[PDB]
Design a protein around this ligand. Structure first.
Ligand SMILES: NCCc1ccc(O)c(O)c1
Ligand SMILES: [Fe+3]
Length: 308
């Protein structure tokens, strides 16, 4: 039968009891695996996420000097590339994040301040997430303009590398785009298409998500710029994606939806969007082909999904 999905924004609280409990930091391969302090610090951030409930302010955390040093290294190194590689929407908002959210080399911004700023721009809000959510729950949150965000940071032994999302990736990669109204509507359309969709389509939407929100390129004037969070938080791939090496294809969902990708090396190919409004339209058309015995609409006044 139709798989369950949240109908009010508060029902998102039901996701905490549905994450992968044995996370990446438990693998022998993780940069912080033999470090017991790092291991305890991760447990500490996971307990904060676990106990969090919709509507509460996100807890503030005092980051250690070692964590701030890792943040500073990542921040200074990536910052040099945005003016020439990042899409206009990213560069337009960055100064405001520096002024009101504390985006600076010496300070890790607190999620509550960032979430309030996003709320004022487009109504997006953040909630801390323990570990790995299923694609279904992760995309479902977007229908409500809710982004599940990590609050921990990568291990300091390898500042320019992370095998998973961490706070540098969320703040430098995702957050700036969620400040833009058109990108916000586009992300939300992906989430709405996902509600009650059969598993095999959830995987298609997760693949579309990967080639847009995480690794998307966008047309701007007669140029091409990065807007994908995974590119914007990766020093090496951001430079590589705008060089002559990768193959570039126009965003076509029927095709993008089944494309294979790897998470371990630079992407051999990227899809280019004409604009976020156009990508939004393509998602809405694609959602029409998903076999669901109903239709959905979000009502921002009461924060509930209406099932038609
Ligand atoms: N679901 C696979 C892991 C994942 C999901 C969403 C993201 O934004 C990200 O950076 C990584
Ligand atoms: Fe991400």
């Amino acid at each position: 039968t139709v798989p369950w999905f949240p109908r009010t924004i508060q029902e998102l609280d039901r996701f905490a009891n549905q994450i992968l409990s044995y996370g990446a930091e438990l693998d022998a391969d993780h940069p912080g695996f033999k470090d017991p302090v790092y291991r305890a610090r991760r447990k500490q951030f996971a307990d904060i996420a676990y106990n969090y409930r919709h509507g509460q302010p996100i807890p503030r955390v005092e980051y250690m000097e070692e964590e701030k040093k890792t943040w500073g290294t990542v921040f200074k190194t990536l910052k040099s590339l945005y003016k020439t590689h990042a899409c206009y929407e990213y560069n337009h908002i960055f100064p405001l994040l520096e002024k009101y959210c504390g985006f600076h080399e010496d300070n890790i911004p607190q999620l509550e301040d960032v979430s309030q700023f996003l709320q004022t721009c487009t109504g997006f809000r953040l909630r801390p997430v323990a570990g790995l959510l299923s694609s279904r729950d992760f995309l479902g949150g977007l229908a409500f303009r809710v982004f599940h965000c990590t609050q921990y940071i990568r291990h300091g032994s390898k500042p320019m590398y992370t095998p998973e999302p961490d706070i540098c990736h969320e703040l430098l990669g995702h957050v700036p785009l969620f400040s833009d109204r058109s990108f916000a509507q586009f992300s939300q359309e992906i989430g709405l298409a996902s509600l009650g969709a059969p598993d095999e389509y959830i995987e298609k939407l997760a693949t579309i998500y990967w080639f847009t929100v995480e690794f998307g390129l966008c047309k701007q004037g007669d140029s091409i710029k990065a807007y994908g969070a995974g590119l914007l938080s990766s020093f090496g791939e951001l430079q590589y994606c705008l060089s002559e090496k990768p193959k570039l294809l126009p965003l076509e969902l029927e095709k993008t939806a089944i494309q294979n990708y790897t998470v371990t090396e630079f992407q051999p190919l990227y899809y280019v969007a004409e604009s976020f409004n156009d990508a939004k339209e393509k998602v809405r058309n694609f959602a029409a082909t998903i076999p669901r015995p109903f239709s959905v609409r979000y009502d921002p006044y009461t924060q509930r999904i209406e099932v038609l």
